[PDB]
Amino acid sequence: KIETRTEPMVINMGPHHPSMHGVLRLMVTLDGEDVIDCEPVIGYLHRGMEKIAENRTNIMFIPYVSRWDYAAGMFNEAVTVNAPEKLAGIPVPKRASYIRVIMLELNRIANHLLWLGPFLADVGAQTPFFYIFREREYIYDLFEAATGMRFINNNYFRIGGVAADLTYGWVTKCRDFCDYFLPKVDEYERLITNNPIFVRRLQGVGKISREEAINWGLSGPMLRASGVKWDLRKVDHYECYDDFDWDVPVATEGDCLARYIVRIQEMRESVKIIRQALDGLPGGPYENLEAKRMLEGAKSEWNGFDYQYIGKKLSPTFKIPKGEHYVRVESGKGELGIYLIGDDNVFPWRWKIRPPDFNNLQVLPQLLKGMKVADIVAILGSIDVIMGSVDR
Amino acid sequence: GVYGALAGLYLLVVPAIVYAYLNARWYVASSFERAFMYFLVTFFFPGLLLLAPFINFRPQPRSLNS
Amino acid sequence: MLLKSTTRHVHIYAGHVVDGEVHPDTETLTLNVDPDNELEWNEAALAKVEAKFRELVANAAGEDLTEYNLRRIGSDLEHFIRSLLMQGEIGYNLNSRVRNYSLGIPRVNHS
Amino acid sequence: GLLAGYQFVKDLESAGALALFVPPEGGFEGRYQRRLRSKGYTTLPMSAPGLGDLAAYLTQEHGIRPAHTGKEDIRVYFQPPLVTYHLENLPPNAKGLVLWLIDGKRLSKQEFAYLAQLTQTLPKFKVVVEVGGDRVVRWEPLADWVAA
Amino acid sequence: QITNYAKEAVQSAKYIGQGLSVTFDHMRRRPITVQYPYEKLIPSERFRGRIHFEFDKCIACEVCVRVCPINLPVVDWVFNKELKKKELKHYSIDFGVCIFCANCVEYCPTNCLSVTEEYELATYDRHELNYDSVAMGRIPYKVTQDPMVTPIREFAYLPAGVMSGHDLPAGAQRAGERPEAIAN
Amino acid sequence: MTILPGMTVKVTNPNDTYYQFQGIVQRITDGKVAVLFEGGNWDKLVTFQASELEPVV
Amino acid sequence: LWLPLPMLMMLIVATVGVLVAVWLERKISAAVQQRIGPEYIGPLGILAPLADGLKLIFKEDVLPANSDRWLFTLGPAVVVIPVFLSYIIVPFGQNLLISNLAMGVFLWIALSSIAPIGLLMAGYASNNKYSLLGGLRAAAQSISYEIPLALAVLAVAMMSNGLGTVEIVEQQSQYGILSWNVWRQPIGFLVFWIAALAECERLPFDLPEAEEELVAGYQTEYAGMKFALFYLGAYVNLVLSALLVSVLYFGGWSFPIPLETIANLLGVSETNPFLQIAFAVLGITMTLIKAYFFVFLAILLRWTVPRVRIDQLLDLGWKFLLPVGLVNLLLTAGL
Amino acid sequence: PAILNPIARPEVPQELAENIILTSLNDVYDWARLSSLWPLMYGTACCFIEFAAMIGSRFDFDRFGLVPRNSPRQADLIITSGTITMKMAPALVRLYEQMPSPKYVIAMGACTITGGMFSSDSYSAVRGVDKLIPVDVYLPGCPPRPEAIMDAIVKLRKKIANEHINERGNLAQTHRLFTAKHKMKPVPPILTGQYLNAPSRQAPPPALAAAM
């Protein structure tokens, strides 16, 4: 039976784990009310993604990739198609580059909204959990129109660009959505900054210094929430993200309150990049791009290498050239990189996914040092974890 | 406790006319009418429970004129 | 600790069972084939898997007592019960509420 | 209404090929394959889109090709004919079997009529093809449903 | 003291007074919800429901197998040297193994394979999902041609301005396909 | 007019998600016709009710 | 066999008051989330409290592996028969009374103290680490919110000059609505309404494991009929607590004259037979209709305040709700 | 032989005689289980978001009577929404055995039917949840639409009504226990509950910090 002893009690968080960020198992040991140690047991969603890619071509592996960070979706397809297109020197058209910025900034909104709902229920008020997913369902139908699926399994990113152009009533439907969602971003911010009970669960709870964040290895809104200002869309001049004006959200506090305000400010800056890309589109709307295809179809300023969704539709037997590689994409959760080295055949020789959450979950034992029992899911909900990215 | 005088006026004949009202105006009702609509459920609830498997709120078939 | 190897048809535990409650031991291994009645057994083939269960326990009695090694025994039993279906010894249960045919569909031999 | 008797079993022995119109939220169709199963009739609930040609599936043996998934040759699993393999396992002291096809509304009318004319040429065998929807669960023969 | 508990109680018992009012104003709004079996929501023009098949179009070349992520579609074909052209005899895509990525409908020259809109495939048996060539060649189930479903539209298909599909009497998508053929 | 399996029709009714999309029809049945729309990347055929489909030459 | 008609007719009202609250829980919480609630069963969910309770009768109520059999079965029974017995107190109706006990607002606060024992033999007897921890957590929470709950009853005991619940509603019937104790005790209503909500509702409770302080609390290893006492007995405690809000502070069976217009939450005709049956039945169960307003307010308050932790729950009953309950008892007196 | 993987002939007559009264009680027995069955809040991989989108406002979870429970005992239905590896394969059977016997597992997504996209070459994925637990309704899709899960609930609801009240005996597991004694060396457990307080994190060891 259960006895009452005086030694520190170890509780198992269990692989059941009724939460929306995967399947962890924390063997966290308690000291009455404070924790003293915690080991995370990962690998419950290790499907062997790296061994699969050594027997997949690139068009056979593009459906596989949007399952690591399945909150994001096409952020996984961004790193995937950028690994042979930056190695073979394949030019991406300018219009397909701006569709990639449009799709990735909408994924970061959906990445942060799937983070936000479970995080607000873990820190207190459970009523925005049903009103946040309604706002993610608008982003689902924007991908369901352009691609053939809601949030993942959307084979849109290609090696020579993107799979197809947008639908007809699409560019006017962010102007219905991202002109309606942007008033609600400040509504989500005033939930925690106002009502000063939530700040007593997030100030100093899971604080990490700047010097320990670079050493432990962090990226995205967990590194930048310690006062680092490192963003790979600004640092790496990545696919016409440098054609816009947008500020990097930094909060030099380190705590979980700094991680909340950065991720809310990433939602706000993403709509800024979206509106600069919908108006900065080269051919504009597709129904107006196709309009100039019929009036000046012989040889125009349109129908060029740009103003189209792909450079050249490559064969399924596209051989990756020989050479090592490491492509980086600033996801909504951090740096999602892959270490591609390929031989001259269609299968890569090694496909090491460097996930943004695998390197942020190793700090979770150190953040759970002196924190309380009710502030364990408040820490784990603020790392923005998706297991499946951690375990692959 | 009456036998069949005022018991049937609360258990039988008035829940049938609320179910005529609940089927017609439940989703089209306004913010003030729905608050009275929730009151008719909780007040006539011992009568609403007996004639529950004898009324269905399933919508009618469409015509498909296109 | 209760090291166990629980597939659909094979539940190998590291311990002995006293009336439902499983107690973790070090010397013994308990096995009940088909917790759900998907296959209609008989007296002949239930002893045929005992010619396989005590064979694999005696064969792998030089290795470690881990969940990986109990899973290696529980897999080869589950590959042996499937061979009893392909030999036509046992058959599928029809009184079960599920008819999902986990060990392959019924099929005739050589068209 | 609500208190249903055993008129569904008698209509199946009369017509042989019924066509239920169940509520689309489910749960009310299966109360009539309990009255059917109480009268000795066993039930094989299959899926109507999953069947191929009903001649080559029900009364003839079919070569089902499993998922080789790139790591196997093209295997051909010759399954027994469905209605005449479940009849031989069915003992003669009990009555026949019924084909409770769900999602019948994606079957063509040529496959509706083939299931209608088969139930009398094959003894102790009936079908109940769940086709379409209605607010109240109701049945009709397949002979006039193809005549609609 | 006693002059504090009449002032330390007001600071949040009125904040829940301004919180009970906003949640009661959440009940004022119409329930934006898709009742499924009586209002099935219309899929998009690119939605990958399930794969269709044309047996009179598949010239036996196994491009669908080589572009599939798991090489799933079984193409059973003989060479048929009397006619010197390979003619298939069986075709099957075992759904349940099928992720609906639809690489086969994209890399096909003869336009045989094609995605439908029906997502309503759910069997009691795993092997009842191994669709035949004549089971995949069956006609899809359209949401609009069903006299029990009131089909509500999807976002990015409504007219410009409305973000709901319930109180939509008419309209189309928020743009025109060919509006500028006699203008420009 | 009647529809043969392989002609290019286009939809005419306004109370439909596919307003004016055109493509090759496929597998005409007793009351229904599926029209392969040839839309962009993944080709999609959608059932119709054998009407509101005006072909072009 | 149920020979007293005042005992049978009350028990029909005592169970249909719970089935309203399970219906009102799943429909008000759906209206604040802009979803339907249970459709397709009954007309609009009327059979959904019946369907959730009847499935727990038909399930194999199996015990855990190594458990104390007699303390596991009597676990939920210590929680819920103290809140099934104190329905003999609640006085709905002018001519309807079951028992004229000399107390009963003190007998209810005495009977509600057996409920922390049932949370101790539910945590211990289930015999896992996370439910014993949830057993000591749930027991020490209802312990904390009883002395504020007993001191709010002490406030309405000075004004009523007794603990008789027939006499308590008799002091609020001389002016209809101006003589209600909520107008005389504006603070002790809040001491009652927070402390009673911290022992029956879903908002200040760790039994939903959204914070993961345990596995699922003390009611983790309970299933079937034993969980039906934990599920359909926490709404018995919700209605019983809301019945006494509508007796102590709000006047039970107290309401003004119904000779009003069509906007009196009624029909259109002044002399209607539908209003002669909505006046006679309302003359039988009136404070149930008033308790349906605080059941509704308990569901509405769940989606407003944050899901507060256990360290600030117990620092509210002792550090806040107990001194504001002590000074209210002095302000109810002369001082 | 004659037929591979044969169907055993049911020799019992299944004398399922019943009057009007007992089947009228069987209808209430089946309706009470199909119409308010409580799914476990379970999810491993991507299909939990499509399952959690059905919890939300656009698609109503609690409309068929489905209330999500974060406990195996209170829930009966368990929608396996996610790819299960070699790990979570003993954890899902443990979630399955801790349920009252009208369980009705439904598989959701391609990776609980045949292990869909990891069915080709993956060293730790069980190919289909039906290699561990019996499944009532299968649901293809990757991921399925939230409308497509509510069809699988409707297909499940039609299966509860087929269940008979006198066929309640096969819902309990049969116990064909066997016993063998082994000679495997017992190993101390690898994952003990200390991570930071382990005696290797405080300082780097000698014969390695000299070259640092």
Ligand code: SF4
């Ligand atoms: S991809 Fe098209 S052409 Fe190639 S085998 Fe398949 S159906 Fe035939």
Ligand code: SF4
């Ligand atoms: S949908 Fe995917 S798995 Fe299925 S046939 Fe097409 S490419 Fe292959």
Ligand code: SF4
């Ligand atoms: S098939 Fe895809 S969506 Fe479904 S469980 Fe597996 S990874 Fe998730």
